[PDB]
């Protein structure tokens, strides 16, 4: 079976792929990430990410949470600095119910006053579980340091903002960003006319965002942890540009993450380069982030306190060698075999598949099948792979780090 793909006059994409699978599935990818949050309404998407299960017009916060659990589905909300998915699942015998629950979330949220009040202090837990995993305030400060206006808005909500969010400060948001011109009622395990029915009957309804003006800057977090974390990046390019596909392969050239469980990561140029001289624990890998307007590229650090500089000055020097022409072709064609795999393996699962069918539909307007991508990986140039790192090295630098920072250098000391 093949993938339908359409478009209404309202600009509302649809998709459908009746794989004759038992487990239906739906996604509604939307552009409402943290970037469209201005200075006043910070952290609102964090709240709105929890605002599922709340009251609607078509049903209550109670009926939703029980009707779903009866049929046995889900209601998950993946969200990014760009996008805001309202994914679900179910058995295909009972889609017509769960669809009705969904669009009442988006098309008719009441966002009553008091249900919010119970829902705010949940954030102090949500925000807290993440930062047990220390990456997600290292990585946030990058966007806070590097970019300025839109993409610097963390997914998560600042502390002081909690206790103070307004419901009007959602209605204004929903009526300005859940708009049929920039949505995508994706489907799966389900037929196409069914979705074409519902969208025209409920989603047949009617702001913008500024661009990520890169700056170049550094933020520091002396927070007493026993280890160090650090990231060092430079201006990447957005997706769709073939300049992207040179980075995304240059990722695996340089540091990919472990492909072998408990492996020495031999083929990684960077991790191998650290392994000489260093004789203590560490780990390190590439960081590629490619948003619609812009992106970032660099690497991410894990080391002890004293050995931050002695590790970062392996990465920076190494990538210079990758920019000074010192490179081979089989590394690339080996690296492509990784990139050509992770794309396919990511879309192995229906969910990871579903993450890609629509993420294209919002920035782009057409579904690129896997084959057409693998050509774009084959048509890559070893003068783009280089540049690439030339853009990184010569480019302005943004940086952040967390842990003990008594021996961690700035940019300029590199």
């Amino acid at each position: 079976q093949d993938l339908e793909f359409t478009r209404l006059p309202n600009g509302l994409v649809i998709a459908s792929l009746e794989n004759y699978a038992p487990a239906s599935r739906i996604g509604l990818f939307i552009k409402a990430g943290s970037r469209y949050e201005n200075s006043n309404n910070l952290g609102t998407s964090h709240l709105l990410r929890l605002a599922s299960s709340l009251t609607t017009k078509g049903a209550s916060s109670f009926k939703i949470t029980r009707g779903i659990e009866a049929v046995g589905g889900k209601l998950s909300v993946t969200s990014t600095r760009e996008n805001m998915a309202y994914t679900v699942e179910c058995l295909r015998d009972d889609v017509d119910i769960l669809m009705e629950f969904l669009l009442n979330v988006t098309t008719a949220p009441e966002f009553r006053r008091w249900e919010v009040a119970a829902l705010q202090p949940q954030l102090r837990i949500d925000k807290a579980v993440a930062l047990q995993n220390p990456q997600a305030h290292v990585i946030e400060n990058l966007h806070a340091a590097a970019y300025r206006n839109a993409l610097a808005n963390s997914l998560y909500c600042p502390d002081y903002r909690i206790g103070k969010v307004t419901p009007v400060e959602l209605h204004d948001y929903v009526q300005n960003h859940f708009t049929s011109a920039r949505m995508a009622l994706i489907g799966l395990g389900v037929s196409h006319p069914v979705l074409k029915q519902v969208a025209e009957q409920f989603l047949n309804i009617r702001l913008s965002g500024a661009k990520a003006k890169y700056h170049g800057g550094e933020i520091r977090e002396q927070n007493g942890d026993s280890l160090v974390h650090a990231a060092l990046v430079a201006e990447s390019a957005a997706i769709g540009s073939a300049e992207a596909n040179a980075f995304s392969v240059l990722q695996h050239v340089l540091g990919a993450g472990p492909h072998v469980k408990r492996g020495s990561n031999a083929t990684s140029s960077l991790y191998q380069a650290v392994a000489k001289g260093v004789h203590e624990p560490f780990d390190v890998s590439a960081f590629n982030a490619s948003y619609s307007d812009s992106g970032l590229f660099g690497f991410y650090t894990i080391s002890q306190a004293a050995s931050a500089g002695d590790v970062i000055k392996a990465a920076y020097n190494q990538v210079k060698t990758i920019a000074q022409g010192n490179l081979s072709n089989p590394d690339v064609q080996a690296a492509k075999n990784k990139l050509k795999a992770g794309y396919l393996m990511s879309v192995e699962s229906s969910e990871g598949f579903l993450d890609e069918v629509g993420s294209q539909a919002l920035a782009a307007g057409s579904y690129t099948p896997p084959s057409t991508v693998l050509q774009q990986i084959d048509a890559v140039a070893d003068a783009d792979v280089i540049n690439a790192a030339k853009k990184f090295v010569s480019g302005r630098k943004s940086m952040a780090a967390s842990g003990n920072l008594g021996h961690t250098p700035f940019i300029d000391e590199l």
Binding site: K74, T80, Q135, L155, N288
Partner: peptide, 17 residues
């Protein structure tokens, strides 16, 4: 890695990367 949030009604809240 390009970290992404996820909460739910029944899936454990998580941090994709």
């Amino acid at each position: 890695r390009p970290v992404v949030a996820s909460v739910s009604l029944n899936v454990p809240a998580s941090v994709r990367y």
